[PDB]
């Protein structure tokens, strides 16, 4: 078991510990559970889906990286496929408050990046901030997404964001998690191609600036992040954060990032290069290359 899960797991109910212990055995447990795995957990405990999601929030919160706040928040995004994706918040010393990722952004990006086509609900152990309510309104699930919070009745997103602003207001009809492929040819080495492929999936209807970052670990594992804009602009998830969300949830740590590549257009109205370099250098990576899309 990856040590981050040790105390969380110790606090779990006996029959749940028993059902999970095979799954969490592996140090690189992918912070995700398939439909088959949630069925097993339900049979071993008698918990229904919403109660199981709440019981599991301590393992999601165990993936939080919180050097400034020490306020660990876990979220679980339940895909329409039946897969459950964990998510946790990350704060980066040496960067700015704008580089923070929230537990909800982590869980939704985990699902989108894994190829999930839509979400049915998200369970979080603390009420969503307004920045994440706005993030969630970018999704193809719209205001109907169900939010589950400890000790409250479930509600759709429309209840947490009354009289909402979102894509419709700027006449945008392609929503985050819809099928997007921008068609750039992949070139370069493995890492450059991962970065361009990530850029090909980006949600960027407002600036039309596609980008993707790919991180190569010391053991050769690659983690890629696509750019996801938001109608309120600032809740946008930068490309780097996607890659870092996956790296952390899959069991790795910043010390084993070996090199990174950012792919983007040179003439794009928004430029990710400076924030990507700066945050990666703050994390200790110094091998950052940029690939240009055409």
Q: Which residues are catalytic?
A: 104
Residue 236 binds which entry of ligand CTD, Zn ion, a second copy, none, CB below 5-8 Å type-dependent: a second copy
- Give yes or no for residue 102 binding Zn ion (CB under 5 A): yes
Residue 103 binds which entry of Zn ion, ligand CTD, a second copy, none, CB below 5-8 Å type-dependent: ligand CTD
Give the start-end residues of each E strand in 39-164: 74-79, 84-88, 119-124, 146-148, 155-156
Q: From CA 221, how far away is CA 181, in angstroms rounded?
A: 24
State which of residues 16, 80, 118, 270 lies at the interface with a second copy (CB under 8 A). 270
- For residue 91, give the 3-state DSSP assignment: coil
- Given a contact cutoff of 8 angstroms between Cβ atoms, the answer to whether 169 and 231 are in contact is yes
Which x/- pattern, by CB under 5 A, does the window 112-151 give for Zn ion? -----------------x--x-------------------
Instruction: State the minimum distance, in angstroms, from the CB of residue 187 to ligand CTD.
Output: 34
Residue 9 binds which entry of a second copy, ligand CTD, Zn ion, none, CB below 5-8 Å type-dependent: none
State which of residues 18, 26, 94, 165 lies at the interface with ligand CTD (CB under 6 A). 165
- Given a contact cutoff of 8 angstroms between Cβ atoms, the answer to whether 251 and 223 are in contact is no
- For residue 182, give the 3-state DSSP assignment: coil
Q: From CA 29, how far away is CA 25, in angstroms rounded?
A: 7
In angstroms, the Cα distances linking 264 to 51, 230, 290 are 42, 18, 8
Region from 127-135, 155-163, 174-182, 237-245 binding ligand CTD, contact rule CB under 6 A: 127-135
- Give yes or no for residue 186 binding a second copy (CB under 8 A): no
Structural element, H or E, at residue 191: helix 190-200
Binding site for Zn ion (CB under 5 A): 102, 129, 132
What residue numbers does the annotated binding site for Zn(2+) cover?
102, 129, 132
């Amino acid at each position: 078991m990856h040590p981050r899960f040790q105390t969380a797991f110790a606090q779990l109910a006996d029959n749940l510990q028993s059902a999970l212990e095979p799954i969490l055995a592996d140090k690189y447990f992918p912070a995700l559970l398939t439909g088959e795995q949630v069925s097993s957990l339900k049979s071993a405990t008698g918990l229904d889906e919403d109660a199981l999601a709440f019981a599991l929030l301590p393992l999601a919160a165990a993936c939080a990286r919180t050097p400034l706040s020490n306020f660990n928040v876990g979220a679980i995004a339940r895909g329409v496929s039946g897969t459950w994706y964990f998510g946790a918040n990350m704060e980066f010393i040496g960067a700015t408050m704008q580089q923070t990722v929230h537990a909800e952004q982590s869980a939704i990006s985990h699902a989108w990046l894994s190829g999930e086509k839509a979400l049915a609900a998200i369970t979080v152990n603390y009420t969503p901030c307004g920045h994440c309510r706005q993030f969630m309104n970018e999704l193809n699930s719209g205001l109907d997404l169900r939010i589950h919070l400890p000790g409250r009745e479930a509600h759709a997103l429309r209840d947490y964001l009354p009289d909402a602003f979102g894509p419709k207001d700027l006449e945008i009809k392609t929503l985050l998690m819809d099928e997007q492929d921008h068609g750039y040819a992949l070139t370069g080495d493995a890492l450059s191609q991962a970065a361009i492929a990530a850029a090909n999936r980006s949600h960027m209807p407002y600036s039309k600036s596609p980008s993707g970052v790919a991180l190569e670990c010391k053991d050769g594992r690659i983690f890629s992040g696509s750019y996801a804009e938001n109608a309120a602009f600032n809740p946008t998830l930068p490309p780097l954060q996607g890659a870092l969300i996956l790296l952390n949830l899959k069991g790795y740590d910043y010390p084993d990032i070996q090199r990174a590549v950012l792919a983007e257009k040179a003439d794009a109205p928004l430029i990710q290069w400076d924030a990507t370099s700066a945050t990666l250098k703050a994390l200790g990576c110094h091998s950052i290359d940029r690939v240009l899309l055409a």
